[PDB]
Design a protein around this ligand. Structure first.
Ligand SMILES: Nc1nc2c(ncn2[C@@H]2O[C@H](COP(=O)(O)OP(=O)(O)CP(=O)(O)O)[C@@H](O)[C@H]2O)c(=O)[nH]1
Lengths: 141, 62, 673
């Protein structure tokens, strides 16, 4: 990685291809290639399941080369994956969207502790509790 | 004067140097002059192989 | 009889970004030589046999880069003029790409070395970094700004000092200034290394430590320029008069003759598109390209043409293969130095003008009737801006058509049509400064008094509410016999563009209440009313009508009586149906540098442009926006202002959306007034 001047964390997908049009955001007042991105991700795509946008960064070095910063499928889209109900954001308190057990996140928190980095696997569970209610979820065992 | 347009579809754009010939149509009172569809702004008219001299079309390809 | 070889001909363009000094450099050329213009050059030291230089001075503005394209295509070599202060400009990159498209072997002249901030080596580095070129300095500037005295010739390793007292007509070779000897030796080695790369034999001599002769250096650098591998860079400044003379020597030494350029490609007029070539020889069949038409007040149409092969005489019926029109050549002159020697022998390589050709346009091939050929065609870009032009009087009306016709003939990138809806004459061009010049010529050369406005937005009409049971009863039983007609219709909106006809008619008549013979007359009565809407008199679109109820009278019922009833029913129903005024929206695409991106959208937002998205490209960003036609006027010059002249937009008609309530209502009121 490098300084936060060649920092945009991005890439909703790899099969939608070009990360320059709407699908892939950013690529503004920065300057870098676009097809020069997904080829290293092509040796990296087939471990991630689709429907799970992974955050990676366009970190450009001082010598024009750029690869990505791998951080695993996160909190938000796994509750659209492991529960089975998508984004719907805005309503945590209006009508019931879905309740999630305690251990349903802990089994994928070991996968998500390679995505989230504060300290630990258990410690990142209460921030999977975060964006779920912003998507509209409720959580109780 | 008021002229008359021959053929069945023209190539006109309202400021076009077109040529006038005699002849009353007997069907529009006040229109006494024909135009020539072979001269100076009206080319060989569409879809015609007979009496080509009238309406100014050249002989077809073969 | 070997007179002046075609290998002594230099057909050259002078090309530069707007405001760089290229015709003043050409006026200097004419002064030194002795004088499209023909000149003769023997070298600054008179070291050469007389060479014929045909100069095309190409426009600096991007609104007239269409003329530059025509020139580049018809020319052999080019002199690219750069400002020593400004360096490579956005407009220079455009001209550079055009010269690359046509593979024109070219050299470089860094002018304006007498101004503040002049830096030769900075411009050399910008040619490398911005244009992706391989610049090889032939010269170094001695001093800069007010201290600019002369140039070092890196081939001869001598300073060139021009005499200020004779406006640079004489010069002396001096020893290199002591402060520049190290820098001159460095760039001389870089020049020799660049010469050695032209062939394995010269590379072996150079690596062997053998000194290359001046003739080998010049021959090697010439070969690579002809291959477009390198660009030779010269410098100098007029007023005190420097560089031009030595740049003209570099034109002789390094730029192509007509025989050094590949044969011109064409197609035989055999109906099979058979490829053919024309070599630069007097013994080949006649072939020429018409590349400029100029309207002259005294002689009429001047058609400028460049002969590639064979010979023609003033007064020779040739064949315009492109337009299949036998065109007898008119009076043909030639700018022999200062005089205009009328030539009855236009040989290969020559540039001349013919008087009074009728059916010749820019890009037409003129050839021998017994050896027909079509030389490659010029693609003309689509116009990027349009304006409405209205004549003040009826005398101006006919005169406007004539004037605009002449301007469209000499300049293909200029288009003129009558808009069928507004009946306005629309003119379109390659930028607004382009259209400004066109309008100036129309209201001066032809002196046609016209108002310049904006293309009228094509306003449409529709309803936003189903209305049922709308009675229309034309019951006129008076004046001899009566005329009875009675229909009941439902009116409803369609989804915009859901029907290619913009109109649906449903016959749901049950019980023969209306004879089947009158139903087409009802539909026709509605369709005539659709042409002139009851709100503001615009065409009505996106509407369905269901005729389901009606009545006739055995003696008084008429076809047109039912058509009158249909119109009544329609006019009453339409007023109840909440009628609205529509609008067109235009899909706009803007290509801009990444740093200029922001400004583009700031203005587009004020122009009600709904930015759909963006496609960051190599130049910068390809922004896409939905912008009303009304707000898409005068954008060419506005964009040129925000982006410092490095942006290009396109626009297409998207769909017939709904005009914002405010906009629609405002126009409805104005139309009613
Ligand atoms: N002091 C000085 N002035 C120069 C020099 N070369 C040109 N000029 C002056 O600059 C101007 C040249 O015209 P300019 O506007 O710069 O070039 P241009 O716009 O590309 C020509 P066009 O209008 O055809 O595109 C003239 O006023 C000329 O006298 C120079 O070397 N030194």
């Amino acid at each position: 990685a490098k300084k936060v001047q060649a920092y945009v964390k991005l890439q909703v997908a790899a099969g939608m291809a070009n990360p320059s049009p709407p699908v892939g955001p950013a690529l503004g007042q920065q300057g870098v290639n676009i097809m020069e991105f997904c080829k290293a991700f092509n040796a990296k795509t087939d471990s991630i399941e689709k429907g799970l946008p992974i955050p990676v960064v366009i970190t450009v070095y001082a010598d024009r080369s750029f690869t990505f910063v791998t951080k695993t499928p996160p909190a938000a889209v796994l509750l659209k994956k492991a529960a089975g109900i998508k984004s719907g954001s805005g309503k945590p308190n209006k009508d019931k969207v879905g309740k999630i057990s305690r251990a349903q996140l802990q089994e994928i928190a070991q996968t998500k502790a390679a995505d989230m980095t504060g300290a630990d696997i258990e410690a990142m569970t209460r921030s999977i509790e975060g964006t779920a209610r912003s998507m509209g979820l409720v959580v109780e065992d | 004067v008021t002229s008359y347009i021959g053929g069945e579809g023209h190539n006109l754009q309202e400021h076009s140097v077109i040529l006038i010939r005699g002849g009353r149509v007997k069907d529009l009172p006040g229109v006494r002059y024909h135009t020539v569809r072979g001269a100076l702004d009206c080319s060989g008219v569409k879809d015609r192989k007979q009496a080509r001299s009238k309406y100014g079309v050249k002989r077809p390809k073969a | 009889a070997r007179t002046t070889p075609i290998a002594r001909y230099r057909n050259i363009g002078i090309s530069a970004h707007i405001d760089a000094g290229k015709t003043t450099t050409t006026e200097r050329i004419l002064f030194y030589t002795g004088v499209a213009t023909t000149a003769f050059w023997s070298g600054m030291a008179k070291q050469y046999e007389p060479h014929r230089i045909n100069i095309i001075d190409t426009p600096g503005h991007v609104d007239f880069t269409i003329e530059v394209e025509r020139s580049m295509r018809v020319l052999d070599g080019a002199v690219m003029v750069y400002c020593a202060v400004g360096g490579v400009q956005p407009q220079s990159e455009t001209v550079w790409r055009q010269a690359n498209k046509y593979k024109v072997p070219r050299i470089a002249f860094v002018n304006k070395m007498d101004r503040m901030g002049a830096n030769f080596l900075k411009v050399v580095n910008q040619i490398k970094t911005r244009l992706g070129a391989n610049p090889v300095p032939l010269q170094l500037a001695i001093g800069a700004e007010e201290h600019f005295t002369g140039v070092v010739d890196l081939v001869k390793m001598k300073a060139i000092n021009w005499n200020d007292a004779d406006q640079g007509v004489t010069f002396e070779y001096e020893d290199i200034p002591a402060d520049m000897v190290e820098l001159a030796n460095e760039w001389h080695q870089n020049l020799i290394e660049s010469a050695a790369e032209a062939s394995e034999e010269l590379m072996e001599k150079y690596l062997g430590g053998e000194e290359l002769t001046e003739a080998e250096i010049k021959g090697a650098l010439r070969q690579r320029v002809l291959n477009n591998e390198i660009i030779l860079v010269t410098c100098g400044s007029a007023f005190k008069n420097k560089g031009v003379q030595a740049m003209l020597d570099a034109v002789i030494d390094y730029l192509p003759s007509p025989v050094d350029v590949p044969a011109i490609n064409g197609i035989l007029d055999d109906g099979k598109d058979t490829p053919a070539e024309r070599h630069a020889s007097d013994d080949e069949p006649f072939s020429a390209l018409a590349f400029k038409i100029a309207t002259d007040p005294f002689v009429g149409n001047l058609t400028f043409f460049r002969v590639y092969s064979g010979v023609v005489n003033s007064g020779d019926t040739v064949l315009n293969s492109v337009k299949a029109a036998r065109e007898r050549f008119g009076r043909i002159v030639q700018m022999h130095a200062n005089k205009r020697e009328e030539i009855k022998e236009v040989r290969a390589g020559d540039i001349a003008a013919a008087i009074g050709l009728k059916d010749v346009t820019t890009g037409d091939t003129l050839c021998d009737p017994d050896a027909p050929i079509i030389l490659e065609r010029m693609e003309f870009p689509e116009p990027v801006i349009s304006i409405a032009v209205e004549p003040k009087t009826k005398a101006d009306q006919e005169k406007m058509g004539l004037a605009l016709g002449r301007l469209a003939k000499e300049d293909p990138s200029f288009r003129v049509w009558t808009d069928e809806e507004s009946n306005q004459t629309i003119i379109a061009g390659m930028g607004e400064l382009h259209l400004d010049i066109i309008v100036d010529r129309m209201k001066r050369e032809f002196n046609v008094e016209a108002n310049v406005g904006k293309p009228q937005v094509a306003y449409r009409e529709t309803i936003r509410q189903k209305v049922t049971d709308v009675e229309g009863k034309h019951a006129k039983q008076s004046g001899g016999r009566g005329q009875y007609g009675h229909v009941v219709i439902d009116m409803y909106p369609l989804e915009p563009g859901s029907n290619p006809k913009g109109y649906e008619f449903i016959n749901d008549i049950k019980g023969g209440v209306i004879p089947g013979e009158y139903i087409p007359a009802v539909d026709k009565g509605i369709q005539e009313q659709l042409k002139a809407g009851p709100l503001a008199g615009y065409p009505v679109v996106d509407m369905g009508i269901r005729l389901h109820f009606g009545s006739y009278h055995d003696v008084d019922s008429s076809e047109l009586a039912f058509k009158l009833a249909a119109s009544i029913a329609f006019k009453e129903g339409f007023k109840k149906a909440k009628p609205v005024l529509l609008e067109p929206i235009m899909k706009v695409e803007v290509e801009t540098p990444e740093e200029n991106t922001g400004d583009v959208i700031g203005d587009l937002s004020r122009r009600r442009g709904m930015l759909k998205g963006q496609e960051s490209e190599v130049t910068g960003v390809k922004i896409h926006a939905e912008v009303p036609l009304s707000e898409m006027f005068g954008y060419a010059t506005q964009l040129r202002s925000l982006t410092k002249g490095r942006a290009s937009y396109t626009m297409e008609f998207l769909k017939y959306d709904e005009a914002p309530s405010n906009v629609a209502q405002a126009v409805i009121e104005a139309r009613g007034k």
